[PDB]
Design a protein around this ligand. Structure first.
Ligand SMILES: [Zn+2]
Lengths: 509, 178, 417
RNA sequence: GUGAGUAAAUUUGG
RNA sequence: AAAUCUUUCUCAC
């Protein structure tokens, strides 16, 4: 049916693929591709472009954001029981805490300063040294990549050591700053539509467009290229250490360590990889492996191909095409004048995940579609009515409801089929407010959140004064004192636990 | 003495790390959303409770009526800018007993960019989803340190040269810099 | 005590009074303000609170007594202090950004930089590699798509029946007959019976993929929504016959036969065998008490079942129909047939897309979108984007890929672009 | 490697 | 047995 669409359709209506296939095969093939590229027989991994038009941020203070150093994402922790390296998977928060415990350090900034300040690689920084840190930071673990539409085969992501993550965070922050400075496209966070509009404006002055993709992007960005870019932007010893760890990286597949000297593992240094091409030439609008450019004559196209080759941005011959009447970037398709291309485009269907979550999500999707030119409003209203009918067929059993109120949705025992326009313009019973995309959370969302939320934990450090930074050092006594002071102040007001604060109600009055 | 085990070997840790160690991880349920909602009639009980108790206390909102003629145009990014709170009212809100985390979140400005291809004569901003129909949206740096009496602090005089004092007109500690 | 903070201390307390006129903070770096006859325990002394204040850079602790209050100046122009008051004073006072020596900079060079660079140099480096010769030609034509479809068909062939895809049509039996047939089929396969439920026990695996072939298209899929809802219900209700308005299925857990002490209940990872009924007249016919029906099985992964059971067939069909061209009639093998073909078979194709958990049709659709938007493509390379057989394995995904290619061929044949 | 039992997915979706 | 290294429950020693 996607083949018989009048306009552009990516076939995103159904959910993405699923699989529990182990990631060992994907990682093994990725490492084999990297090894093949290293021997210079498949693609190019040697950077030749001149990265001289890049500002040198050598004097910029080393800025570390601690928010991204702690998270629930998985990471690899390395131990040396009897001289043999053992790799375990643990939350990034636990990994960072273990790293800080091994080398006594109040915060990651102190660890970075100590690492950069020692006078030798064997000097102790606690129960470790820079040599040991570098040796342990080259170990990675394989995991299954998140499923995405259009990729039936499972892909592999790689979890790194906390030290590697810290250095990567620093270099990536500075590389993103340089990228934002070099061009206005990467201001802070450009969505697909914003990038598409900017590209349409940029490439309007030429005839042909070169909607293109880079193949084997992660396997072709060598440690040499990363070090070259980092030196160009002035990364100092941090860049050298990171390049050394990348060159010596080892991946634990199943139960064996395999060497992968070639390329990088996954999209870790996206900013640096983009900066390679961007500093090579001001002719492309590239976001990692996705780029777009325009040309007028075959000689210009040959120059573009040579520029891409010299920047280790090997063109993907399978899914790169030349267009004259359309532009395409990050799945967003636009007309040369800037208008969104007619058709469904990237519209995605809403799977059944609850009586009211489904309605809220389909309402949000239809609002997004109608706000653009995807479909007229009447079509969206008909689709909303159809979805309400489907939800009624699916959720109108006693196991979900025992009510027969007139105002209730047909799927919860009622006999109300709210018009899409009536729902959007707050013209319904208050029970329907939760179904509005901007309305409060639905009953299903709260129930599922409670289910998810249902260890010898520490003393909770919530309800903090907004004026205290999160980088302040606190001991056990400090936490207890803060809790006691907050409780005493709340009691002085004759009040229980603090009342929830919502910005909308505060602005209303 | 969990502090001595989670942070073994360190007596002081940053607030970020300590809070990261109290996130209360959420476990990925192995069942679908439908089966989870059916389990123990949790959703049915929640719906009964909401209808009986929560629904009557809902602050009924007004219905949108303002409309303007619109015509299809190029794709644009409609920008909604919600300002964040400032130090003064943030301190006041925290002192009054509101949750500190919520106020901390509200101190950050919010920017919403929405792709819309629809324009009006006056270039009005439209509501969520209602773009086709045309529903429109329309010296001394005295600093308040706190709204409480800190013990053993000098009272604010007529001409506070540069110190920190207490104000009687407004129940707050004032820092008079410069 | 460090001499790099002297100036920083001076600006920290310009003219700040504490009692009536006297300056609140005494700077230890100035003799006139320094307190004689007492050991110095910090950068500055506060007389109201009788405390010592020390300034440190980010991650650079100084040697001062624990009693001394430390005010950290972060690299992002943000200050921290255990005492809110001193934090505010420093925040307002240090607006004039004055760089302090010792601040760590991203360009910092460690004493081991040369050694690490030498180690990197001694390590292996990549070779250049060949420059591709790119030829830009017109996109593939109908002939190339027909060639790809014919290659797939001759390489894999067709099944005699539609297998589980026939379960989207009525089997011609009532609820009682359907339940009896399913239960008697489960008994015939010698499935274990326990706690009123069926369990399929296995001991050894051949460790080879099952035979792959293309499924012929049934005439229509009237019971697509019913079947998908039944699978969604069976995600957890396994071992007993599930009934719908017009059809039934039986999802039996697949468990290892360890021995006398064996697994007795399903767990999160336990696979299912979904057994469904369709009209008889194929190899998989089953008869009991005069009731005859074709019994077709599908081995489903729990993630596969969860993904399949959540699809919205009707809404997807309507969204596709919003801006669709005229769908032609097609034959059992996805070939244009204006004489005896049926337009309802397209519904079946959609149902197949819902049943295929790898969604290779999504990849085919993305490539076809590129094809329709392309003026020129790389010769002999773009055409190798519809060859997705290596990316998938199984009868259902193979059939889905074949019929996606057939849909592309039909679009090019009937509505050329 | 040996032995034994059989909290969690059925309760409750036409 | 199948969309085939997946269908791998608990306890004690
Ligand atoms: Zn058959």
């Amino acid at each position: 049916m996607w083949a018989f669409q009048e306009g552009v359709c990516k076939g995103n209506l159904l959910s993405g693929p699923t699989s529990m296939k182990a990631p060992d095969s994907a990682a093994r093939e990725s490492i084999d591709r990297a090894s093949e590229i290293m021997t210079g027989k498949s693609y190019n991994a040697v950077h030749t472009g001149d990265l001289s038009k890049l500002p040198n941020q050598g004097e910029s203070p080393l800025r570390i954001v601690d928010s991204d150093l702690y998270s629930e994402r998985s990471c690899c922790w390395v131990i040396e029981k009897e001289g043999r390296v053992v790799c375990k998977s643990t939350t990034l928060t636990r990994g960072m805490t273990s790293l800080l415990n091994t080398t006594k350090c109040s915060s990651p900034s102190e660890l970075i300063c100590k690492v950069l300040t020692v006078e030798s690689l064997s000097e102790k920084i606690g129960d470790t040294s820079v040599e040991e840190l570098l040796s342990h930071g080259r170990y990675f673990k394989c995991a299954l990549r998140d499923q995405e539409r259009g990729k039936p085969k499972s892909r592999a992501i790689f979890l790194s050591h906390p030290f590697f993550r810290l250095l990567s965070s620093v270099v990536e922050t500075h590389a993103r700053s340089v990228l934002s400075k070099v061009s206005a496209v990467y201001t802070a966070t450009a969505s697909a539509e914003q990038r598409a509009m900017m590209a349409a404006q940029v490439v309007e002055s030429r005839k042909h467009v070169l909607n293109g993709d880079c193949t084997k992007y992660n396997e072709a960005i060598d440690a040499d290229t990363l070090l070259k870019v980092w030196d160009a932007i002035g990364m100092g010893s941090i860049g050298v250490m990171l390049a050394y760890m990348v060159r010596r990286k080892c991946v634990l597949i199943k139960d064996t360590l395999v060497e992968c000297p070639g390329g990088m593992l996954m999209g870790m240094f996206n900013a640096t990889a983009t900066l390679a091409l961007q500093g090579t030439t001001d002719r492309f609008l590239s976001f990692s492996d996705d780029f777009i450019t325009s040309f007028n004559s075959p000689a210009e196209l040959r120059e573009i191909e040579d520029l891409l080759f010299a920047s280790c941005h090997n063109l993907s011959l399978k899914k790169s095409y030349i267009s004259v009447a359309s532009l395409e970037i990050n799945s967003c398709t636009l007309t040369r004048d800037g208008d969104l291309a007619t058709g469904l485009g990237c519209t995605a269907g809403v799977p059944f995940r609850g009586p009211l979550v489904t309605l809220k999500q389909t309402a949000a999707m239809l609002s997004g579609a109608v706000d653009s030119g995807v479909m007229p409003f009447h079509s969206a209203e008909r689709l909303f009515q159809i979805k309400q009918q489907e939800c009624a067929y699916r959720y109108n059993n006693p196991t979900y409801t025992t009510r027969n109120e007139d105002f209730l949705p047909t799927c919860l025992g009622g006999k109300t089929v709210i018009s899409f326009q009536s729902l959007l313009t707050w013209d319904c019973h208050p029970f329907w407010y939760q179904v509005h995309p901007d309305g409060p959370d639905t009953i299903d969302q709260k129930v599922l959140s409670v289910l998810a939320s249902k260890r010898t934990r520490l003393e909770a450090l919530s309800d903090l004064d907004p004026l205290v930074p999160h980088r302040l050092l606190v001991s056990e006594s400090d936490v207890s004192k803060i809790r006691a002071a907050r409780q005493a102040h709340l009691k002085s007001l004759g009040l229980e636990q603090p009342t929830n604060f919502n910005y909308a109600i505060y602005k209303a009055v | 003495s969990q502090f001595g085990k989670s942070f073994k070997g360190r007596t002081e840790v940053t607030i970020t790390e300590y809070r990261s160690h109290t996130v209360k991880d959420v476990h990925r349920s192995l069942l679908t959303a439908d089966k989870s909602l059916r389990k123990s009639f949790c959703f049915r009980n929640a719906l009964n409770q909401f209808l009986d108790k929560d629904l009557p206390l809902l602050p009924i909102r007004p219905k949108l009526e303002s409309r303007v003629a619109v015509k299809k145009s190029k794709l644009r990014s409609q920008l909604s800018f919600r300002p964040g709170l400032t130090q003064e009212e943030a301190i006041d809100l925290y002192n009054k007993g509101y949750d500190g985390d919520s106020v901390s979140g509200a101190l950050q400005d919010r920017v919403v960019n929405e792709p819309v291809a629809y324009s009006s004569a006056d270039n009005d901003k439209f509501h969520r989803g209602l773009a086709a129909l045309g529903y429109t949206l329309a010296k001394a740096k005295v600093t308040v340190l706190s709204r409480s009496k800190w013990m053993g602090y000098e009272d604010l005089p007529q001409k506070p040269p540069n110190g920190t004092f207490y104000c009687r007109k407004r129940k707050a500690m004032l820092l008079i810099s410069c | 005590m460090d001499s790099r903070f002297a100036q920083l201390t001076g600006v920290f307390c310009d003219d700040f009074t504490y009692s009536e006129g006297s300056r609140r903070f005494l700077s230890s770096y100035s003799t006139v303000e320094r307190r004689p006859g007492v050991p110095v325990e910090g950068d500055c002394y506060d007389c109201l609170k009788n405390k010592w204040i020390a300034f440190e850079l980010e991650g650079q602790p100084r040697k001062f007594p624990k009693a001394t209050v430390r005010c950290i100046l972060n690299n992002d122009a943000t200050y921290v202090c255990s005492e809110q008051e001193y934090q505010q004073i420093c925040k307002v006072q240090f607006k004039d950004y004055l760089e302090i020596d010792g601040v760590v900079k991203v360009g910092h060079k460690a004493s081991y930089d040369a050694e690490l660079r030498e180690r990197l140099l001694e390590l292996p480096h990549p070779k250049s590699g060949p420059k591709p010769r790119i030829e830009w030609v017109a996109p593939p034509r109908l002939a190339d798509i027909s060639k790809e479809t014919a290659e797939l068909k001759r390489q894999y062939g067709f099944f005699e029946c539609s297998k589980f895809l026939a379960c989207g049509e009525e089997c011609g039996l009532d609820q009682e007959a359907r339940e009896l047939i399913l239960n008697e089929y489960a008994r015939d396969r010698e499935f274990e019976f326990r706690n009123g439920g069926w369990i399929q026990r296995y001991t050894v695996a051949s460790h080879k993929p099952a035979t792959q072939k293309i499924l012929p298209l049934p005439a229509s899929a009237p019971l697509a929504r019913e079947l998908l809802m039944l699978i969604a219900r069976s995600t957890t209700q396994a071992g007993k016959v599930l009934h719908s308005d017009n059809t039934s299925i039986l999802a039996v857990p697949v468990m290892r036969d360890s021995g006398k002490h064996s697994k007795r209940r399903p767990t999160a990872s336990t696979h299912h065998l979904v057994v469904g009924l369709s009209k008889p007249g194929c190899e998989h016919d089953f008869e009991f008490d005069g009731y005859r029906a074709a019994v077709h099985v599908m081995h489903l992964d729990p993630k596969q079942s969860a993904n399949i059971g959540e699809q919205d067939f009707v809404s997807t069909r309507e969204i596709y129909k919003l801006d669709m061209l005229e769908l032609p009639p097609i034959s059992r093998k996805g070939d244009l047939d204006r004489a005896s073909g049926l337009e309802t078979r397209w519904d079946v194709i959609l149902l197949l897309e819902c049943l295929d958990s790898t969604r290779v049709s999504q990849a085919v659709a993305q490539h076809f979108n590129r094809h329709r938007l392309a003026l020129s493509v790389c010769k002999d390379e773009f055409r190798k984007g519809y060859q997705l057989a290596s990316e998938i394995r199984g009868t259902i995904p193979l059939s889905s890929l074949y019929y996606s290619l057939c849909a592309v061929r039909l679009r090019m044949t009937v509505h050329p672009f």
